[PDB]
Write a protein that binds this ligand. Structure first.
Ligand SMILES: Cc1cc2nc3c(=O)[nH]c(=O)nc-3n(C[C@H](O)[C@H](O)[C@@H](O)COP(=O)(O)OP(=O)(O)OC[C@H]3O[C@@H](n4cnc5c(N)ncnc54)[C@H](O)[C@@H]3O)c2cc1C
Length: 121
């Protein structure tokens, strides 16, 4: 029996933001966002996930404070995601995620009737 490291995370921080996905957004913009953010998060040691439904964003990031902020300063110069109201930046221990996630991928499949494919013609 070996002892686990337990909650070891002195310098993590989790910025948890609420945004309202601007109508100026394109799927291609999300699909570009997702790809570049994973890559940055992987490097910056940031873990994450994203909840996007009804055009509203709940997205948060767990990482070492300044990385998170490096990320914040890179994101907060947006116009993409309606307001991006972080409003919550809290120092965490992290462990929860090992990678950042995004719901929007190459299509969503089936749930398109709830926003994507509103009408035909
Ligand atoms: C809903 C949403 C969620 C997001 N979540 C995350 C996230 O979790 N993590 C994250 O990191 N980002 C996130 N972003 C930001 C998104 O991924 C941006 O497109 C951004 O990541 C672009 O790459 P960047 O992080 O390197 O910063 P950016 O500065 O926006 O990169 C793009 C620009 O940087 C320039 N650039 C790159 N490297 C250099 C350099 N060395 N010197 C000078 N200029 C340079 C490029 O020329 C380009 O013009 C999110 C954005 C949105 C809308």
């Amino acid at each position: 029996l070996e002892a686990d490291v337990t909650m070891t995370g002195s310098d993590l921080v989790s910025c948890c933001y609420r945004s309202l996905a601007a109508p100026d957004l394109t799927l291609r913009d999300l699909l570009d966002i997702v790809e570049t953010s994973q890559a940055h998060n992987a490097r910056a040691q940031l873990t994450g996930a994203l909840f996007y439904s009804q055009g509203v964003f709940f997205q948060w990031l767990e990482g070492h404070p300044a990385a998170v902020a490096e990320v914040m300063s890179h994101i907060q110069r947006d116009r993409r995601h309606s307001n991006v109201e972080i409003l919550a930046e809290e120092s965490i221990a992290k462990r929860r995620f090992a990678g950042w996630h995004m719901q929007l991928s190459c299509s969503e499949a089936d749930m398109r009737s709830l926003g994507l494919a509103e009408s035909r013609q």
